[PDB]
């Protein structure tokens, strides 16, 4: 994966799962079951995605449930996006 792809993928994944719950996220355990499912939709990204959500599910949960949600921002904090890259 390019650093671009890797950034884009972070965003696509978090946005898709956030849209899935329509912003009403029930619990971290549940959030995680979907983050994992969503990781497996991407052949080349599965392995990295899965470890990313594992380590950072608390940060993703917090940011998602605050109402802010901007995917590109949480991906910057995880350093899967750098200030260089762009949103979607």
Residue numbers in the entry: 1 to 88
Quote the study on this structure.
Na-SLP-1, in contrast, is exclusively monomeric (MALS 12970 g/mol; theoretical M = 13530 g/mol). In the crystal structure of Na-SLP-1, the C-terminal extension of about 30 amino acids, which is attached to the N-terminal Sap domain could not be resolved, which agrees with the results from mass spectrometry. The crystal structure contained two molecules in the asymmetric unit, giving rise to a complex network of molecules in the crystal packing with a variety of different protein-protein contacts. The two monomers in the asymmetric unit agree very well in their overall fold as is reflected by the Cα rms deviation of 0.55 Å. The crystal structure of Na-SLP-1 reveals the presence of seven exposed basic residues on helices α2 and α3, giving rise to an extensive basic patch even on one monomer which is likely to initiate contact with the membrane surface, driven by electrostatic interactions. Crystal packing analysis of Na-SLP-1 reveals a P2-symmetric dimer, albeit with a moderate interface area (571 Å2). Despite being a monomeric protein in solution, this dimer may possess a functional importance in the membrane-bound state, since it combines the basic surface clusters of the two monomers into one large patch. For Na-SLP-1, we found 14 void volumes with values larger than 5 Å3, the largest ones being 29 Å3, 30 Å3 and 43 Å3, using the same probe radius as in the granulysin study. Intriguingly, Na-SLP-1 and granulysin share the feature of a loosely packed protein core, as evident from void volumes in the interior of both proteins. The function of Na-SLP-1, in contrast, may be similar to granulysin since both seem to share a scissor-like motion of the two “jaws”.
In this study, we investigate the structure and biochemical functions of two SAPLIPs from human (Necator americanus) and dog hookworm (Ancylostoma caninum), Na-SLP-1 and Ac-SLP-1. The structure of both hookworm SAPLIPs were determined in hexagonal space groups, and closely resemble the fold of the Sap domain, as known from saposins and other SAPLIPs. The fold is comprised of a four- or five-helix bundle, where a kink in the third helix can lead to occurrence of two helices, α3 and α4. Three conserved dithioether bonds link helix α1 with the C-terminal end, helices α1 and α5, and helices α2 and α3.
